[PDB]
C-alpha cells in the first residue's frame, strides 16, 4: 500500500507525469516491478563507500576547488550523525556526479 | 505531541543537508522525491536498483523531447 | 624509450608512473589523467603527501 | 620556474642542515601556488581564464563549419565536370544563404 504509493510518487515526480491512467505510467510501473523482483545486485558495503567518498574529496582538491572539497567533507560529516547513511550516499553517488562549477552558495 | 514534530523538523534539516549534497553533485532530484527514496530504503532497497530505475525514467523523458 | 629520458636512471623513471582520476559521468581523458611520483625510501621525511598534492594541482594547470 | 628554482637551488646546495632544505622546498612550492591562479583569493581571476578556454574549442567547430559547406561544394563541382567529360546553380543560391549567418556568428 505505502510501497505502491512510494513507487507511484517516484514515477510521477521523475517522469513528470500527472495522469496515473496514462499507459506510459502503467508501462513504467510494470518496468519497476520487473526490475525489483529480479535480484542480482550487490548490497552496499560501507568500506567501498568510504573509499569512494574520500576519493571524491581528493578529486575536488586536485582540481583546485578547495572550498567545495571542504564543504563536501563537512556536509558528509554532518550527515553521518543520527546503514541508511550508506544507502542514501551510494544512491546519490551513483545517480550523477560532479559539476563543472562549485555549485555552493550556502550562507547560514 | 511536541517531540514527534521536532523530529520532523530534524528530518527537514537532514533533507536540506542532502539538498546541498544534491546541488554540488548536480542531481536532478528534488526534496519530495528524496523523501520517497528515504521511505524506500526504510523498507530496504538496492540503491543500484533505484539508480537503474531513475536512469531509465529520466532518459525516457529525453525520448519524448 | 624514444625520447631523451632514456639516458636517465631507471630508478627515477620507475618511481614515476601513471594514475587516473576516479570516474564521473562526463569523463574525458583530458579531464582524467595524472602522473604519480610515489615514495620509495626515507624521502617521505623530505616529501610530504600534500606536497605531491600541490605538485599534482600545478600539474593539472 | 626560474625564480623559485634559483632561490630553491641556492638554499639547498649551500645549506648544511636538512630542515633548511625542507623549509626551502616548502615555501618554493607555496609561493608558486600564489604565483599561479591556484590560490583561494585569485580564484575569480581563474574563473575568467577558464572562459578564455571555451572560445578556443568553440572556434574549432566554427572554423570547420566553413569547410563543411565551402570546401564541400568543389568536389561536387568536379563531379559536375565528370558529367561534362543546373544544380550547382542551386549551390550558388545556397552560398548567399550560408555566408551571412556564419559571418554574424563570427
GROMACS .gro file of C-alpha atoms in nm:
model
  340
    1UNK     CA    1   0.000   0.000   0.000
    2UNK     CA    2   0.259   0.252   0.116
    3UNK     CA    3   0.512   0.071  -0.105
    4UNK     CA    4   0.287   0.111  -0.409
    5UNK     CA    5   0.228   0.478  -0.323
    6UNK     CA    6   0.604   0.537  -0.296
    7UNK     CA    7   0.667   0.379  -0.637
    8UNK     CA    8   0.380   0.582  -0.788
    9UNK     CA    9   0.507   0.912  -0.648
   10UNK     CA   10   0.856   0.826  -0.772
   11UNK     CA   11   0.723   0.775  -1.127
   12UNK     CA   12   0.506   1.090  -1.102
   13UNK     CA   13   0.796   1.307  -0.988
   14UNK     CA   14   1.066   1.186  -1.224
   15UNK     CA   15   0.868   1.123  -1.544
   16UNK     CA   16   0.677   1.443  -1.466
   17UNK     CA   17   0.350   1.259  -1.517
   18UNK     CA   18   0.025   1.378  -1.365
   19UNK     CA   19  -0.207   1.119  -1.524
   20UNK     CA   20  -0.189   0.784  -1.344
   21UNK     CA   21  -0.408   0.629  -1.617
   22UNK     CA   22  -0.152   0.716  -1.884
   23UNK     CA   23  -0.039   0.387  -2.047
   24UNK     CA   24   0.321   0.509  -2.011
   25UNK     CA   25   0.261   0.520  -1.635
   26UNK     CA   26   0.142   0.158  -1.645
   27UNK     CA   27   0.445   0.055  -1.851
   28UNK     CA   28   0.674   0.231  -1.602
   29UNK     CA   29   0.504   0.051  -1.312
   30UNK     CA   30   0.548  -0.286  -1.486
   31UNK     CA   31   0.913  -0.197  -1.554
   32UNK     CA   32   0.972  -0.103  -1.189
   33UNK     CA   33   0.820  -0.427  -1.059
   34UNK     CA   34   1.010  -0.641  -1.312
   35UNK     CA   35   1.338  -0.473  -1.221
   36UNK     CA   36   1.268  -0.502  -0.848
   37UNK     CA   37   1.174  -0.869  -0.839
   38UNK     CA   38   1.486  -0.972  -1.035
   39UNK     CA   39   1.753  -0.981  -0.763
   40UNK     CA   40   2.112  -0.994  -0.890
   41UNK     CA   41   2.260  -0.672  -0.749
   42UNK     CA   42   2.530  -0.640  -0.488
   43UNK     CA   43   2.433  -0.498  -0.150
   44UNK     CA   44   2.605  -0.177  -0.039
   45UNK     CA   45   2.925  -0.221   0.164
   46UNK     CA   46   3.033   0.067   0.385
   47UNK     CA   47   3.408   0.032   0.324
   48UNK     CA   48   3.380   0.080  -0.053
   49UNK     CA   49   3.160   0.384   0.014
   50UNK     CA   50   3.429   0.522   0.246
   51UNK     CA   51   3.696   0.476  -0.023
   52UNK     CA   52   3.463   0.646  -0.272
   53UNK     CA   53   3.383   0.950  -0.053
   54UNK     CA   54   3.749   1.017   0.023
   55UNK     CA   55   3.813   0.976  -0.350
   56UNK     CA   56   3.552   1.241  -0.432
   57UNK     CA   57   3.714   1.470  -0.172
   58UNK     CA   58   4.063   1.417  -0.317
   59UNK     CA   59   3.930   1.469  -0.669
   60UNK     CA   60   3.791   1.806  -0.563
   61UNK     CA   61   4.125   1.905  -0.404
   62UNK     CA   62   4.328   1.810  -0.714
   63UNK     CA   63   4.106   2.021  -0.940
   64UNK     CA   64   4.170   2.319  -0.705
   65UNK     CA   65   3.817   2.372  -0.581
   66UNK     CA   66   3.921   2.382  -0.218
   67UNK     CA   67   3.614   2.533  -0.053
   68UNK     CA   68   3.399   2.285  -0.245
   69UNK     CA   69   3.606   1.999  -0.101
   70UNK     CA   70   3.583   2.146   0.250
   71UNK     CA   71   3.205   2.181   0.217
   72UNK     CA   72   3.181   1.829   0.070
   73UNK     CA   73   3.365   1.662   0.359
   74UNK     CA   74   3.182   1.892   0.603
   75UNK     CA   75   2.835   1.805   0.469
   76UNK     CA   76   2.907   1.433   0.473
   77UNK     CA   77   3.047   1.463   0.828
   78UNK     CA   78   2.732   1.640   0.948
   79UNK     CA   79   2.511   1.386   0.771
   80UNK     CA   80   2.688   1.091   0.936
   81UNK     CA   81   2.532   1.168   1.277
   82UNK     CA   82   2.184   1.042   1.383
   83UNK     CA   83   2.338   0.182   0.730
   84UNK     CA   84   2.075   0.413   0.581
   85UNK     CA   85   2.365   0.660   0.562
   86UNK     CA   86   2.544   0.441   0.309
   87UNK     CA   87   2.221   0.360   0.124
   88UNK     CA   88   2.134   0.727   0.064
   89UNK     CA   89   2.503   0.806   0.000
   90UNK     CA   90   2.553   0.522  -0.251
   91UNK     CA   91   2.231   0.631  -0.424
   92UNK     CA   92   2.331   0.997  -0.459
   93UNK     CA   93   2.687   0.899  -0.557
   94UNK     CA   94   2.585   0.677  -0.847
   95UNK     CA   95   2.288   0.893  -0.965
   96UNK     CA   96   2.512   1.162  -1.115
   97UNK     CA   97   2.849   1.303  -1.013
   98UNK     CA   98   3.038   1.631  -1.002
   99UNK     CA   99   2.962   1.964  -1.168
  100UNK     CA  100   3.187   2.196  -1.367
  101UNK     CA  101   3.111   2.472  -1.114
  102UNK     CA  102   3.139   2.478  -0.737
  103UNK     CA  103   2.756   2.489  -0.702
  104UNK     CA  104   2.798   2.627  -0.349
  105UNK     CA  105   2.605   2.933  -0.233
  106UNK     CA  106   2.505   2.833   0.120
  107UNK     CA  107   2.541   3.119   0.371
  108UNK     CA  108   2.400   3.002   0.711
  109UNK     CA  109   0.271   1.576   2.060
  110UNK     CA  110   0.568   1.815   2.060
  111UNK     CA  111   0.875   1.589   2.045
  112UNK     CA  112   0.724   1.399   1.750
  113UNK     CA  113   0.721   1.721   1.544
  114UNK     CA  114   1.071   1.839   1.636
  115UNK     CA  115   1.185   1.508   1.486
  116UNK     CA  116   1.002   1.614   1.169
  117UNK     CA  117   1.195   1.943   1.177
  118UNK     CA  118   1.505   1.725   1.217
  119UNK     CA  119   1.400   1.528   0.904
  120UNK     CA  120   1.375   1.856   0.713
  121UNK     CA  121   1.719   1.963   0.841
  122UNK     CA  122   1.887   1.649   0.702
  123UNK     CA  123   1.677   1.695   0.389
  124UNK     CA  124   1.839   2.038   0.337
  125UNK     CA  125   2.179   1.881   0.405
  126UNK     CA  126   2.102   1.639   0.122
  127UNK     CA  127   1.980   1.941  -0.076
  128UNK     CA  128   2.329   2.093  -0.067
  129UNK     CA  129   2.472   1.748  -0.142
  130UNK     CA  130   2.242   1.722  -0.446
  131UNK     CA  131   2.345   2.055  -0.596
  132UNK     CA  132   2.721   2.013  -0.551
  133UNK     CA  133   2.678   1.674  -0.721
  134UNK     CA  134   2.434   1.812  -0.987
  135UNK     CA  135   2.147   1.566  -0.948
  136UNK     CA  136   1.801   1.634  -1.084
  137UNK     CA  137   1.625   1.514  -0.770
  138UNK     CA  138   1.413   1.742  -0.551
  139UNK     CA  139   1.311   1.720  -0.187
  140UNK     CA  140   0.979   1.538  -0.214
  141UNK     CA  141   1.124   1.264  -0.433
  142UNK     CA  142   1.421   1.213  -0.200
  143UNK     CA  143   1.175   1.171   0.087
  144UNK     CA  144   1.012   0.898  -0.124
  145UNK     CA  145   1.357   0.741  -0.167
  146UNK     CA  146   1.412   0.766   0.210
  147UNK     CA  147   1.090   0.570   0.268
  148UNK     CA  148   1.206   0.320   0.005
  149UNK     CA  149   1.523   0.250   0.199
  150UNK     CA  150   1.314   0.230   0.518
  151UNK     CA  151   1.165  -0.082   0.360
  152UNK     CA  152   1.507  -0.182   0.224
  153UNK     CA  153   1.619  -0.150  -0.138
  154UNK     CA  154   1.923  -0.166  -0.362
  155UNK     CA  155   2.049   0.183  -0.448
  156UNK     CA  156   2.182   0.009  -0.760
  157UNK     CA  157   1.821  -0.079  -0.848
  158UNK     CA  158   1.684   0.269  -0.771
  159UNK     CA  159   1.958   0.424  -0.984
  160UNK     CA  160   1.869   0.192  -1.272
  161UNK     CA  161   1.502   0.291  -1.230
  162UNK     CA  162   1.582   0.663  -1.233
  163UNK     CA  163   1.848   0.610  -1.506
  164UNK     CA  164   1.565   0.469  -1.715
  165UNK     CA  165   1.299   0.724  -1.614
  166UNK     CA  166   1.496   1.047  -1.669
  167UNK     CA  167   1.623   0.938  -2.013
  168UNK     CA  168   1.275   0.830  -2.104
  169UNK     CA  169   1.180   1.198  -2.081
  170UNK     CA  170   1.456   1.266  -2.334
  171UNK     CA  171   1.283   1.031  -2.579
  172UNK     CA  172   0.964   1.239  -2.595
  173UNK     CA  173   1.161   1.559  -2.627
  174UNK     CA  174   6.240   0.499  -2.478
  175UNK     CA  175   6.230   0.713  -2.791
  176UNK     CA  176   6.300   1.047  -2.621
  177UNK     CA  177   6.594   1.197  -2.426
  178UNK     CA  178   6.457   1.046  -2.100
  179UNK     CA  179   6.623   0.712  -2.187
  180UNK     CA  180   6.967   0.833  -2.072
  181UNK     CA  181   6.837   0.897  -1.721
  182UNK     CA  182   6.844   0.645  -1.438
  183UNK     CA  183   6.594   0.356  -1.442
  184UNK     CA  184   6.513   0.414  -1.074
  185UNK     CA  185   6.363   0.762  -1.114
  186UNK     CA  186   6.173   0.672  -1.429
  187UNK     CA  187   6.048   0.368  -1.237
  188UNK     CA  188   5.926   0.577  -0.942
  189UNK     CA  189   5.718   0.794  -1.179
  190UNK     CA  190   5.417   0.603  -1.306
  191UNK     CA  191   5.070   0.676  -1.441
  192UNK     CA  192   4.750   0.743  -1.244
  193UNK     CA  193   4.393   0.847  -1.321
  194UNK     CA  194   4.104   1.033  -1.166
  195UNK     CA  195   3.817   0.828  -1.028
  196UNK     CA  196   3.523   0.837  -1.260
  197UNK     CA  197   3.246   1.092  -1.321
  198UNK     CA  198   2.960   1.098  -1.576
  199UNK     CA  199   3.138   1.342  -1.806
  200UNK     CA  200   3.476   1.168  -1.832
  201UNK     CA  201   3.734   1.283  -2.081
  202UNK     CA  202   4.092   1.159  -2.059
  203UNK     CA  203   4.185   1.525  -2.071
  204UNK     CA  204   3.974   1.555  -1.754
  205UNK     CA  205   4.102   1.224  -1.615
  206UNK     CA  206   4.481   1.170  -1.607
  207UNK     CA  207   4.772   1.223  -1.367
  208UNK     CA  208   5.127   1.110  -1.304
  209UNK     CA  209   5.226   0.987  -0.960
  210UNK     CA  210   5.570   1.010  -0.811
  211UNK     CA  211   5.549   0.794  -0.500
  212UNK     CA  212   5.789   0.743  -0.214
  213UNK     CA  213   6.035   0.453  -0.227
  214UNK     CA  214   6.267   0.527   0.067
  215UNK     CA  215   6.323   0.770   0.355
  216UNK     CA  216   6.231   1.057   0.119
  217UNK     CA  217   5.882   1.072   0.275
  218UNK     CA  218   6.057   1.264   0.554
  219UNK     CA  219   6.155   1.514   0.283
  220UNK     CA  220   5.845   1.495   0.058
  221UNK     CA  221   5.503   1.506   0.224
  222UNK     CA  222   5.195   1.365   0.056
  223UNK     CA  223   5.020   1.706   0.048
  224UNK     CA  224   5.333   1.834  -0.128
  225UNK     CA  225   5.262   1.579  -0.401
  226UNK     CA  226   4.905   1.713  -0.397
  227UNK     CA  227   5.021   2.069  -0.471
  228UNK     CA  228   5.258   1.913  -0.726
  229UNK     CA  229   4.961   1.748  -0.896
  230UNK     CA  230   4.747   2.063  -0.881
  231UNK     CA  231   5.004   2.276  -1.065
  232UNK     CA  232   5.049   1.974  -1.293
  233UNK     CA  233   4.676   1.988  -1.365
  234UNK     CA  234   4.705   2.356  -1.455
  235UNK     CA  235   6.025   2.807  -1.287
  236UNK     CA  236   6.343   3.009  -1.280
  237UNK     CA  237   6.283   3.248  -0.985
  238UNK     CA  238   6.166   2.991  -0.733
  239UNK     CA  239   6.411   2.748  -0.897
  240UNK     CA  240   6.710   2.985  -0.849
  241UNK     CA  241   6.633   3.055  -0.486
  242UNK     CA  242   6.548   2.686  -0.430
  243UNK     CA  243   6.880   2.575  -0.587
  244UNK     CA  244   7.069   2.827  -0.375
  245UNK     CA  245   6.917   2.740  -0.038
  246UNK     CA  246   6.954   2.365  -0.092
  247UNK     CA  247   7.305   2.350  -0.219
  248UNK     CA  248   7.456   2.600   0.028
  249UNK     CA  249   7.264   2.465   0.329
  250UNK     CA  250   7.414   2.212   0.571
  251UNK     CA  251   7.100   2.111   0.758
  252UNK     CA  252   6.808   1.901   0.637
  253UNK     CA  253   6.537   2.122   0.790
  254UNK     CA  254   6.654   2.425   0.593
  255UNK     CA  255   6.629   2.229   0.267
  256UNK     CA  256   6.283   2.114   0.377
  257UNK     CA  257   6.169   2.466   0.464
  258UNK     CA  258   6.306   2.595   0.130
  259UNK     CA  259   6.125   2.337  -0.085
  260UNK     CA  260   5.805   2.410   0.109
  261UNK     CA  261   5.798   2.786   0.057
  262UNK     CA  262   5.921   2.722  -0.302
  263UNK     CA  263   5.610   2.527  -0.396
  264UNK     CA  264   5.389   2.753  -0.181
  265UNK     CA  265   5.488   3.081  -0.349
  266UNK     CA  266   5.443   2.903  -0.679
  267UNK     CA  267   5.082   2.833  -0.572
  268UNK     CA  268   5.029   3.207  -0.519
  269UNK     CA  269   5.209   3.287  -0.846
  270UNK     CA  270   4.964   3.085  -1.049
  271UNK     CA  271   4.591   3.138  -1.019
  272UNK     CA  272   4.566   2.834  -0.792
  273UNK     CA  273   4.521   3.042  -0.475
  274UNK     CA  274   4.195   3.084  -0.285
  275UNK     CA  275   4.176   3.461  -0.336
  276UNK     CA  276   4.282   3.472  -0.704
  277UNK     CA  277   4.008   3.222  -0.799
  278UNK     CA  278   3.784   3.486  -0.959
  279UNK     CA  279   4.086   3.568  -1.176
  280UNK     CA  280   4.099   3.194  -1.251
  281UNK     CA  281   3.728   3.197  -1.340
  282UNK     CA  282   3.786   3.442  -1.625
  283UNK     CA  283   4.077   3.238  -1.752
  284UNK     CA  284   3.854   2.933  -1.788
  285UNK     CA  285   3.629   3.147  -2.007
  286UNK     CA  286   3.926   3.203  -2.239
  287UNK     CA  287   3.932   2.825  -2.299
  288UNK     CA  288   3.569   2.798  -2.413
  289UNK     CA  289   3.601   3.015  -2.726
  290UNK     CA  290   3.906   2.810  -2.827
  291UNK     CA  291   3.716   2.483  -2.864
  292UNK     CA  292   3.412   2.670  -2.998
  293UNK     CA  293   3.630   2.817  -3.273
  294UNK     CA  294   3.735   2.467  -3.389
  295UNK     CA  295   3.372   2.386  -3.465
  296UNK     CA  296   3.307   2.730  -3.616
  297UNK     CA  297   3.615   2.709  -3.838
  298UNK     CA  298   3.532   2.362  -3.966
  299UNK     CA  299   3.169   2.461  -4.027
  300UNK     CA  300   3.307   2.686  -4.300
  301UNK     CA  301   3.484   2.397  -4.473
  302UNK     CA  302   3.189   2.161  -4.422
  303UNK     CA  303   2.996   2.384  -4.666
  304UNK     CA  304   3.254   2.593  -4.859
  305UNK     CA  305   3.509   2.323  -4.940
  306UNK     CA  306   3.244   2.054  -4.974
  307UNK     CA  307   3.097   2.205  -5.290
  308UNK     CA  308   3.408   2.186  -5.505
  309UNK     CA  309   3.439   1.806  -5.529
  310UNK     CA  310   3.075   1.815  -5.639
  311UNK     CA  311   3.190   2.070  -5.898
  312UNK     CA  312   3.447   1.813  -6.010
  313UNK     CA  313   3.164   1.562  -6.027
  314UNK     CA  314   2.970   1.807  -6.245
  315UNK     CA  315   3.275   1.816  -6.475
  316UNK     CA  316   3.281   1.435  -6.474
  317UNK     CA  317   2.933   1.466  -6.620
  318UNK     CA  318   3.073   1.716  -6.872
  319UNK     CA  319   3.352   1.484  -6.990
  320UNK     CA  320   2.177   2.327  -6.318
  321UNK     CA  321   2.216   2.203  -5.969
  322UNK     CA  322   2.524   2.390  -5.850
  323UNK     CA  323   2.327   2.693  -5.960
  324UNK     CA  324   2.131   2.594  -5.650
  325UNK     CA  325   2.459   2.591  -5.454
  326UNK     CA  326   2.535   2.945  -5.572
  327UNK     CA  327   2.195   3.028  -5.426
  328UNK     CA  328   2.292   2.832  -5.113
  329UNK     CA  329   2.605   3.043  -5.070
  330UNK     CA  330   2.403   3.368  -5.039
  331UNK     CA  331   2.214   3.177  -4.763
  332UNK     CA  332   2.514   3.031  -4.578
  333UNK     CA  333   2.756   3.329  -4.576
  334UNK     CA  334   2.564   3.593  -4.364
  335UNK     CA  335   2.475   3.358  -4.078
  336UNK     CA  336   2.831   3.228  -4.035
  337UNK     CA  337   2.960   3.586  -4.068
  338UNK     CA  338   2.721   3.713  -3.798
  339UNK     CA  339   2.816   3.424  -3.569
  340UNK     CA  340   3.184   3.516  -3.615
   0.00000   0.00000   0.00000
